[PDB]
Structures are given as structure tokens and as C-alpha cells.
Design a protein around this nucleic acid. Structure first.
Lengths: 149, 117
RNA sequence: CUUGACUGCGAGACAGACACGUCGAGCAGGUACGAAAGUAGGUCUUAGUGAUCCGGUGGUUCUGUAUGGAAGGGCCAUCG
RNA sequence: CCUUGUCGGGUAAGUUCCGACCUGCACGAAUGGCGUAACGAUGGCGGCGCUGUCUCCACCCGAGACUCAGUGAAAUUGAAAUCGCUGUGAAGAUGCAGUGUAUCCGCGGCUAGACGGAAAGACCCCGUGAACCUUUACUGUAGCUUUGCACUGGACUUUG
RNA sequence: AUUAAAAACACAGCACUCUGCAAACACGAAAGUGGACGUAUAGGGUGUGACGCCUGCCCGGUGCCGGAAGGUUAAUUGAUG
RNA sequence: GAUGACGAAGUGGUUGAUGCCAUGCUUCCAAGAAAAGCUUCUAAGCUUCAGGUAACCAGGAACCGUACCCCAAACCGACA
RNA sequence: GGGGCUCAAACCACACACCGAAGCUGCGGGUGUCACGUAAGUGACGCGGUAGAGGAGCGUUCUGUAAGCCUGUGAAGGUGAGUUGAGAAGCUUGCUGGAGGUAUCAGAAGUGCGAAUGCUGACAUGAGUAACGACAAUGGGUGUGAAAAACACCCACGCCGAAAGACCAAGGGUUCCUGCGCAACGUUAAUCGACGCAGGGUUAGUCGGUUCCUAAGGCGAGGCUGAAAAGCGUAGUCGA
RNA sequence: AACCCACUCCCGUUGAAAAGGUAGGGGAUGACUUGUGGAUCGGAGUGAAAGGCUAAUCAAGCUCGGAGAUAGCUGGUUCUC
RNA sequence: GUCAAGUGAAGAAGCGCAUACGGUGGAUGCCUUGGCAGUCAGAGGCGAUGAAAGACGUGGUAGCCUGCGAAAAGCUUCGGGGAGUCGGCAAACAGACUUUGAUCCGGAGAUCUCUGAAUGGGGGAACCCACCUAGGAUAACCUAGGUAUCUUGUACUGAAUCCAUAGGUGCAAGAGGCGAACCAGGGGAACUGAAACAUCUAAGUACCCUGAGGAAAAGAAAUCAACCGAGAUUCCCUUAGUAGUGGCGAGCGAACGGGGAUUAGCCCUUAAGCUUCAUUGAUUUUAGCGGAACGCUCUGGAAAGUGCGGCCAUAGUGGGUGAUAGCCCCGUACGCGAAAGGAUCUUUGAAGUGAAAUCAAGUAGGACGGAGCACGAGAAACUUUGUCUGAACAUGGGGGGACCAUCCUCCAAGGCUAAAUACUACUGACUGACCGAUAGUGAACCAGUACCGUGAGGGAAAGGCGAAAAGAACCCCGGAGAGGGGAGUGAAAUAGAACCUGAAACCGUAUGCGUACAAGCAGUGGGAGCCUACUUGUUAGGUGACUGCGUACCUUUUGUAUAAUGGGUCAGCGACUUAUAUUCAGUGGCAAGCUUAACCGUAUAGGGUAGGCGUAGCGAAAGCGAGUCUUAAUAGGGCGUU
């Protein structure tokens, strides 16, 4: 705000040369390459996305980090029930990938601290690499072969 | 990500001011003068790792000159006679024997006079 | 006596920052002279000059804002 | 301009002054020419008085300076353990070389140097900088003016 | 105003020139207003600067004023090719 | 020293303004504010009681500013 | 260059020896390139540098890793010490501090300061120097006080007196008065103050204003005019 | 004399003062000086004219915008090998 | 013993260096009641029923904020809440109020001083003076209403002037002003670029002005296309930096055709729609209610942390609680909830409006002078019009980029229309590889303040004790001071109010060593001596006599110690960014193909291949094509072709 006038005349004052109070050298003044709201979203190709997916499912296989179950279904919307269902599998810090997220399976584990429930479309490279184990159903493995090739 | 540069500027100025301690006045306590004094000390120290090897050689040569003239020989005649012979012995230990072990230096100047140079 | 002060080009060089510039055997088409080999793409040689954009003029196979034409534009030759 | 032209006067001595001369570089008649009493905080010369202007300054009186008590700035400043001379050198040196001098620190003074301090030189140059003034620069425009067409009609006469 | 008080400006007086009134002229896209509730002895512009004696020659340039009417000449006309 | 009561003389002559008479008088050109209050006249009306004019009696005069500085330390000069 | 130099410490020759550089060599490290090498692995030639090109890194803040790990048995910061690297820098610790910090590997930058007569704060030097604001002028006594050249009172001296006196307008806005005070303000000190705190003080028919009236000028119903905004103006009604 | 002015010297120049002081000087019944209120304003006022003045600013005020004008110019540009 | 000569250790007015403690000073770290930027919603105005913005009053203490308005930190009612309260800086203190339900919160009322469009008349804003009607009041007033201007409508009245017109009086209704932006118009620069500059650009931008609305504007073909067709308008991605346009310079820049977001056309033989009412159900909003599950132990001032064992979960990375908490509190997920208002949508009536009358004449067209269309009047179409003119009438008329025929396509001179679109001063929630006190707003704090200006206008600086004031009873020096020395509080007071940490500049005191015969960038190589710690030695730290070499740094230059520039110093800050197009390198994915843009999307996925580039070139082009262009040439030559 402000900064219209020259602060002083340019000669005679014996002082350095300013054209505004709000110059970026000054402490009232502006910042020199002041930010404006930008976007950081970049282009990943569709094939490059799908090919980065096909090589982390491969590493989830090789590192024994992927766990396939026939079906994963909870009965009631209770976090204790889903803790008990994962504790049979010996399984904390897991990404559960089902073919379509049920509301019972979503209401449980949306409080649970290290568990995430996603569908196949809604899975991403960061959540595949992040969780210490990845649980997929057989229908999810069908859906990954449909999507990724 | 605004990053406030006052914590690293301080440690870099402490390093320069620590390298400048012992100096006169503002050479040891204000940064824009201590910095120049530290750089200048570094140039002189580079130059004087060379002139150390120049100055000690001249002192050895002057002491060998003084020791050889007590035995009736110059420096230059002594260095010539120690190569008509073969001594391979340097100005450092000859100056050390000139001060400390005077009978051994007398033996060395007699074996230079023995080669008649 | 006569038009080679030709038309299409052009191997290859010289010069050269670029735009320019310089020389040119040979090939085709037509011609001068010469009985004929041959010479002839101006002048013994190097100065005598001026970019582009605008306009003018003569052609043209081209384009031609629905279509047939024109208008205007394009290319080729030329003038200020 | 030559030029302090020449001649006269004034002075011991006068590039100034006054009176002439006319060879007017380059006066001249309302961008007026010549005179002109009175009037100028007007320009230039000379005189009487008058005197510290001066020879040439002496003394005295207050106010600062100096010391003491209290309060308490400034411009400037790369850091300083901050001499002379002669050289040398971006060509005028406290700092370089050689060589002389020089115990350490104030206070009062004086300003010869620190190319001293103050103002990104005003002169000069330069900028395909600017501003403002001029005109017979270029290009325009306000205003003034000419004609046509409107608003704008009928009636006669001269006339193509 | 704050480095120039003068020989500069002003001035009475003088002359030129414009202006007939809804004035010339000025400020105003205009309405209006000043000139002026004045009216040529008035009002504007310009130059000179009390007074005394005077104020010479030139109308080519440029301006201003008047004059025929010949050439040129704009919009507009729209014959002819 | 603060206060209550008592409290002497308190007159005459001269000189006198830049004050007053005086918004007068004389003179000169440069020819010297408006409007109201005030005095007076009628109009439109009144019924010509209202209104006016004197006397007498009783009553009233709102609001606002007032301290302090003004040849200044209080205003205007950044300052006692 | 100086001291000084005369069968020279000068000059002309010739000889032999020596000194002299970051030059060469020796010895120990690091680095570039090239060739070899089952990639230990050596060799050889290099390695001054401004503008500039190219290559490889350090550190700061944020995000992910991270609901992790560290940390009140003590974080970040600050201040020493030691130590390790070619460097930017790292690591360990004594004291201070008293609540946060971020291995690693990646992502992102308000990413690194000595200069711009750079900005803003603190503080220097000049320097306890110049000044302390008209050269009307002060001297005692007494009191009060913690302390009086400066306050108050007394005695005396000066100064103004067409003002340095009294007053009105404007402008200011409590500065006025009285108690209590003296940090700061007062160019010194202050017990004093136009300063701080708290109280009080301004009384109108007649003095000024409002109210009544108008001048310059303003505004102006309607109205004329103007792209709009507006301009000018009649009735009017403000304006000393 | 007041008042208004500002010719001379000296001081002052970090001033007591961003234009003064002290000595002297000019006008001082007028083309005078001054209070209070009002009018004229930025290619625009007013000017007895000097480029004077228009709020310590003037060959085109101040302020805010166009605006971070433009600068073939000057200055600066921050860790390491 | 003496006398000579030689030799020289202490004795510092003051300085220097190191070290240790201080002081100043506020950096740094950490923190936040403040900002900044988005997303999703809201509702898009307030005002003559008096606004925005104020002045003055209003309290037991009474200054300033914040509320209120002479009924003045409040009054009356409904509704919620259920234990404290009498707003804040500002902690205390009085007098009190509350379970017979205060305070507090929401809805509706009541009051609402003066200013300000300010509106009874004036006026220098917050002041001055009025009139009329009604009622009440004893030579004084008081209550409640009115009293502006304009426009429109209406009534009465009526000048010159006969009639009736102007005009005038009274009624009704409406307006005016303010607000950051968005929108439609009127008027409209200059710097700048063109490496000068005039055309041109910047730019129909900035600015000024006028209207309107929650959006506006535009909109239902006298529109485009080429003989095929599409059908209103707006917005977005492309076609494309292409065609054009341009001192053919700087530059400016389409359309056809696609892909989408959106979805509607009704009428002038009277309609959709939109308003305003009354209703019909329904939804939201303005307040709230409930809302799970932890103990023991160690260190500690304090436990949330350590060690162990649990529990809850449609609630686990929220805030703060004496250190880090799902289970301590407020909350959160999740359900419930409204006397009364408001808002949106929906019925089904009603009055209006739309609405200009009846398919468009001073109109189309044209001549001059302009303006726009990307288009600098140009071959210049099409639009608009300042001046002047001026038609046909469905066997008409205008468009298809000069113009003319032929076709194709529409019906101008009357209208009204939702959505997609823009914007955000203002609210609410949520979010951030946003800032964290020189930053972020100018403004974290009583900031548009203080201050500066005559004004317009400019415009600051200033955050942090502690968990809790437990904010230091009492004693002593001192002036019933200031400031300290103790004692207490506290984990800590070198956390003591100027208070977290507490750097550097700068200023001191103490100790060690060196400094008074020595000449200069103040160091560096050598180096004696002395002093401390160690434990001693071929060490570590501190001084550094003496001595060789040695003219700072920057910037600019052919060159600087330069007597050239720049810097007093310190600490903070302060300079290659970002967007969009593109080229090259590196690195990946797919590969004769690759890739999507808007947009759709339970949304970083998937879809969408419109478009872009590549697979073929040559030519100015028609065109022709592994060829093509030039050419009289199957010749030459240019460019191209696993």
C-alpha cells in the first residue's frame, strides 16, 4: 500500500536514490518475485501411469508385500470387528483394495489408524508404496488385469 | 518456504572472527575488516611456506660459511670439495654440525681440503 | 557482310559474415560471318551505381470467398 | 576594434574624467535624434572639511576564547602501530625503494598537506535523454474566412 | 519574497491603428459576462515616453488597406469515352 | 497582620488636548455603500368590537461566549 | 639503492667454483583425461587464470518418509572446547537455555550477502569538544529543604516606561487558581514552573454573538444553455 | 516618528533567524499602508514585467493515479570444488 | 674495601592481545489472540418505516474501546439454557441481582437525542430560527402530528385572450444517497514500443460520467454454409498465431468446420414469462440437546512422557489441561431439535405487467464526412450515422466480401425471454510443501491512530513474566526517593514486571604477558623470554622482545596502493522469478504411430482422440506425386525419396 511519491528529490540530498517508499530494498516494501497462486499439477501420460502401476504391483509381489484373499467382507460397521478380521491375517498397517468399497467396510477402518480401504480405481502409487502390506481381493486382481493389461 | 538466514550468517561470521583473533582492533572484531585480514593472512602464509624453504637455506649456508672460514676454507670451495669427493650431505646437517659437533665438521672440511678443492 | 549486345540453362571455380558480386567449358534451340577448321552469350581489363515496400505497363497454365465471369491477388518480363 | 587615437586642461606623475578633433571597425531622428531646470539610497571624475583607511599600529573597555562545575551536539569515518627528503609509480606518496631524523601522551594556537569536508561537476563532451521558447523546419489544429446543401419562402425584372 | 532597485518597468504627454453599439476585443463547446448601464472628446490594441527644437530619404521584400476583373482554383455537378 | 465600628480635608486659580460640539463649517475634484429598524401615507380588507393612541397596574427580557495568554513561553515561526 | 670502493668491490678478456625461482629433481599426498585392467589398478601425460562454457557438491526452510525416531535423565537456539574432511561444512561434548527437534532418501524453494552515496533499528568516532539563544545586572540577609547562584520574603542595586505598562479582536483551548509533587519536560540545579496528579474557578435585558438588515461574493425554485458531470442566472435567501 | 520598505557595511553562514541583527539609509496625504470577508488556478491564473508570484516548491504547483513510464546509461548481484 | 671499564633486572601516565565475568542492545530460536491465498456454500444489497458514516450523551468508582439512545452496557415478550452474574483494557473494590430461575444465546417487538440524501427555513455537520392543526397549561410554555424539491397521476382554480392554454393551490404514488467488484453505455489520454518519429502502437486501456441487476448484456435468423446441409443467445477448448491486415514496419488478428457446458421458445386476434398478494404441502436457515472408552508405576515442580496391562471407535494425527492424551475437559463421528421470524422450491386462484398495437417508411438503399467490423477506404462487402436525400410491397425485399447474372438461403425497419457466464466489499465452514513480528494487511499492541501537510493527501513505531500473581510480608542504606542488599514466593528471580532466549556492534572491571631509542595495510615465516594448566616434554593454552618478506577490499578500466568510485560499524532485510508458447540436451513411456484440450467423472483413476505432431515431397499455385519444379526438352540443374 502507498508508495506513490518519490521520497526525496534526486540530487542535493546527499542520500541514496529512491523512487518509492515501497521498493523491495526497503523494509516497508514489496517482495521482489512475489508469489501468486499457481498450480503444481503436472502431466503424467496415461500409459506412463499404467506402466508405473504395473511395476509396483510386481514389487508388491516380489517383496511378499501383496496379500491376496478370496473375498474380504465385514459384517457390521465396527472398528473392533475389522481389527479382529485383520488380526487373523496377522496384519497391521495394510491397504485394503477391494473391487468396490462397501459401506460397512468403509465405516470401519475410516477411524482405524494405519488401515486404508480403497477400490481399484481409487488406488494410487503413493498408497501402494506407503502401507506396509497391501491386501487385495480376487476381484481386485481381476480388475487390475482389466485396467493395467 | 520463507527461510530466515540469520542463524547461518552468524556461524559463518563466527568462523571468520575466530580465524581473526589476536589481531589489532577492528581486524579482530568487525567482520568486514576481519575477513580481509584473514584472507591476507592466508596469502602471506601461502607465500611463506615457500619463503621458509628459502630463508632456512640461507641461514644454513651462512653458518656453513662461518664454520668453514674458521678452518681456512670458503663456503664455495667447501661445496666444490665436497663434490670432488662424494658427501651427499646437506646444508641442514652441515649447519647442525657447524654449531654442535665441531670436530665432525672439522673432519668434513678436512676431507674437502683433501680433495684439494 | 552482319546482330551472339541471342533464348534455356549451366560442370566447376574466384571472391566472400550475409545480401550482393566475378569468371565460365559444355549441352539444347535457333542465328552472324568464313571455302573450312572455327570465332561469336557485347566492348583490352577493372568505375559508370541503388535493396525492399509501394504503385504503372505487357503477357500468363495459376488463383479467382455459392456457382459462371470479373475484381483483386500470384508467377514471368519491364518502368518510375 | 586598432586604442592608453591625437591635441588641450586638471596631477609631480592621469589607460579614468572634462573640452575638442573626425579616420562613425559598427551614431542617427517616436526599437525616436539632439539639448534640458528640478528630482535620484543611479554611473564616472575632481576638491574642501574630516579622520586608525593608511604609514604603523599602541593602549583601554566590555562580549567569546583559556581554566573550574553542570548539561551536552555536528559534518566526517575501509582499518590504522597515521615522519622528512630523494626517487619510483594510474604519471603530485604517511604507507613503495633507498636514506635521514624521531622516548611515550596532552593542552593552547596556526592552517602548509591529508589532490581536506560539504553537492553521483553547473563549464566541456556524450545520450538516436527531457523540458520550455522561436520561426519562412515538418505535420497538424483552435479561431477567423469562401462557397455548396439544409433551415429557406413568393413576386417581378435583366439574363444563359 | 531569499545574491541584481538600476540606466530596467510604469508614467503624464505623443502618434499610429481598430471599433456605429447586440462595438472592436476578452473569458466562456454554449447560454452568458466583462468592455459598459459607457457610445468616437468613447473604448481596445500597439509603439514612444515630461519639456524645448525637431522628427530626413526609400512602397522593392513582408504585412495592412483598396481595385478591376483576365488567368489559376475546392467541395458539388455528372457531358462523353 | 485578618476583620467590625468610627473615619479628617475633600476648595480655588491657571494650562489644556490627538477627546467632544462635529455625520458641523470652509474648500477641492477624483464627485464620495446598500437595506432594515424608524417617521408617514393610503391599498386589499374591517363590520368599522378588532386595531391604534396615552394613563395606571402587575409581570418579563430566552439561548450562547465570558477563566487564562495577545509589543506572547499559551497565536504563526519543528523549539520556553 | 646506501655504506663504501682505486695492483678495485670499476673496465676489457679468459678460467674455475658458488649463490640464486613457485623452473627442474628427490620424497609424501590429492585430482583430470586417455589406454589397459574377470573392474583395486596400474601406467602415461596433465592440473595459473578474467569474461565465459561444462561437471560435481555443501548448507538453510518447508513437505513426504513421520501416528516413525530423538528429547524434561533435557529440544531448538546461544557461547566455549576438541576433532574429522579438498572445500562449502560435519561430528562429539562443557556451560547457558527450558520445549521442541528431524537419520536417511526423495520432492520444493521467499535457498546462502560486505559493498548497490542499499532499507530499518542499535551503537561508535569527532568529544566530554562547540554551544547553553541579544553584552537590563546583580549583591547580601532570612526561611524552606535531603540539598538553594536560580524558589519565596526582606534590604539594596540596576532595567523598561508610546513599553519590557494596562486592554480588545483573531488564533489557542484550561495554559487560570489552590493543595500535593519532581521521574520525564525546563539547554545547568530546582524545594520553582506555562511540567505531573487531584480538586476548584468562567454568573449579563444593557459587554460581545444569536436574533433584525443588507455589501462584495455565494447558492439559487422554475428558467436559458451544455456529450454527461455541469455552467450561468430570475424570484428568492444567505453572507460583516 | 509610528507604519511600510530594504540601498550600504559589518556580523551571522553547524544562525537567535531555511533570508535575520546592529549601525547608518528610502517613502512617509498617497500610483500610500493595513485588518476582515470575497474573486481569479495549472499551457491555467495574476503580473507598473522580473520568468516574478501562485502555501519556505515554479520556463509550467501539489497530490493521487496511467506506473514497476523509459533508460544502448550508472551502481549492485549473496555457498563450495 | 676503593677506583675504572663492561653489562642491565624490576619500577607503565596510558595502551595492545587473550581470558573470565558483566553492561548496553535487541538479533536468534521457539510461540501466536494477526494476516495472506484458495476451495465449497451463502446472499447479493442498505436508504424518506431516514442509510453508510458520525457528534454528543449513557456506568457506583469513570478515561478510552464495545454496546446502547433522555426508556440510553438497556425495556417487553416468546423459545433455548440450568448456576452463576452486574461487557473490555482492568485487578480489585463497593452496592447488589439470581433455582419463585438471573447473566448468557436466538426470534419478534418497544424506545431510537442530534448530524448526514437530511427533506420546515437557514447553516461554518452534529447548530440556529420557524409556521399550521389537535389537546393540555394563569401574562413563560408543553405534548403529538404535520410543513423540502422533483417526476407521474388526479382534483380544484384560471393570465395576456373570447373559448382554453400557460400558470397556481391541494391531494395520492414514486424518486434522490451509500456500497469493493462484476455489467451496459457517454467522453476518452499520455508515457511506452516502432531501437528517432508523425500513420500506427500502447488502447477504446487508465481515468471521469450515466444508468441497471443479482447478475447484466445478448438472444429465437432479412444467420451461416455449397448445391450437401445446419438452425437462438452466452461461455470454454480447438481450427491458429492460420487467412487476412500493417510506414506490408513495430504489430494486430479471424472465420468455416469440429469438441463440449446449457436447453425453452412464446407473442402484436394479446403469449410464455415475471411481479405482488392469498393459499398448498415440503425443504432449509437463524439456538441448542445427547455424544464411547485408563489404571498402576519411574523420573519430575507438574506427566500427556518412561515401563506394564487394558478399553472404546460410523469417534485416532482437533483444541488445552503445570512436558508429548482417542479414553482429563471442550469437543469429534453419529443421531435428535424450533414459540417465533426469514429464504428457496412446489400447488391454485387473483390483480397487474410483459404491451409496443394490428407484421413495422423518413425505414432499406444512396451521396458526402466519420466510426466499426482482425480489415490504416483499400478491389471493400456487411454494420452504424453527423449532414443531404430517398424505395419496392410475396409474380416484394436483403444476404452469400467490389460488381453482374443464375441458384441457394432468409423476412429488417415491434417486442419479451430461464440456464450455462462474470464478480465478492460481505457472511459460514474447511483447507494450505502460506507468513510468523524488519515477515504477514499500512495495522497481531486502543492504526488509517500518532505524526506531517492549508487541504487533497501521506503515513509510523510498539507482541512474549510465570503453569498459577503465588507480582516480592518483614528488616537495612537512601530524600516517607530513585535504586539496591537481604528475607520470602517459585522448579527457576542473572523468570522481578523495560520481565522467555538474550547474539553482534559498542562500553567496562579483574588476571596473565608484551609496550616509553622506535618509523608505514598492522599480517605472515622464523623466534628468545615469561606466565598458566598439567604432569614434566621432542606437549597444550596465552603474550610475542627481536627479525626476513609484506602499499586493504570492491568496482571500473589498457592499467589502481592509488591522491579514481563505494563503504562509520554491527544485526536483520535486500537482486535471474513466474506464467504461457517453443527449441535443444538428458531421461522415461508407447511406437508407424504418439497424444489428448475443454468437458464428463462416487474426481490425481477412468472416459473424452475434436484437435496437434509423425507416416512424402515438389511447386507461387492449379496440380502432380517417389517424385516434382523450371523448360520447347524424355537434356541439364534445384529440392526430395530404403
Amino acid at each position: 500500500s502507498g508508495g506513490g511519491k518519490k521520497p526525496w528529490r534526486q540530487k542535493g540530498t546527499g542520500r541514496a536514490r529512491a523512487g518509492t517508499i515501497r521498493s523491495p530494498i526497503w523494509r516497508g516494501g514489496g517482495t521482489t518475485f512475489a508469489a501468486k497462486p499457481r498450480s503444481h499439477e503436472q502431466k503424467l501420460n496415461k500409459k506412463m501411469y499404467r506402466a508405473a502401476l504395473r511395476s509396483i504391483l510386481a514389487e508388491l509381489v516380489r517383496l511378499d508385500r501383496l496379500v491376496v484373499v478370496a473375498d474380504f467382507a465385514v459384517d457390521a460397521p465396527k472398528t473392533k470387528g475389522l481389527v479382529a478380521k485383520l488380526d487373523t491375517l496377522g496384519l497391521k498397517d495394510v491397504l485394503i483394495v477391494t473391487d468396490g468399497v462397501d459401506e460397512n467396510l468403509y465405516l470401519a477402518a475410516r477411524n482405524l489408524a494405519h488401515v486404508d480401504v480403497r477400490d481399484v480405481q481409487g488406488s494410487d502409487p503413493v498408497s501402494l508404496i506407503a502401507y506396509d502390506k497391501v491386501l487385495v481381493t480376487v476381484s481386485a486382481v481381476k480388475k487390475f488385469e482389466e485396467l493395467l493389461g | 518456504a520463507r527461510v530466515k538466514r540469520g542463524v547461518i550468517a552468524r556461524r559463518r561470521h563466527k568462523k571468520i572472527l575466530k580465524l581473526a583473533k589476536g589481531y589489532y582492533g577492528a581486524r579482530s572484531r568487525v567482520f568486514r575488516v576481519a575477513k580481509q585480514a584473514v584472507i591476507k593472512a592466508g596469502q602471506y602464509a601461502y607465500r611463506d611456506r615457500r619463503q621458509r624453504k628459502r630463508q632456512f637455506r640461507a641461514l644454513w649456508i651462512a653458518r656453513i660459511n662461518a664454520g668453514a672460514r674458521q678452518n681456512g676454507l670458503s663456503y664455495s670451495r667447501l661445496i666444490a670439495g665436497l663434490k670432488k669427493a662424494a658427501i651427499e650431505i646437506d646444508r641442514k646437517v652441515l649447519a647442525d654440525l657447524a654449531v654442535n659437533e665441531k670436530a665432525a665438521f672439522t673432519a668434513i672440511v678436512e676431507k674437502a681440503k683433501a680433495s684439494l678443492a
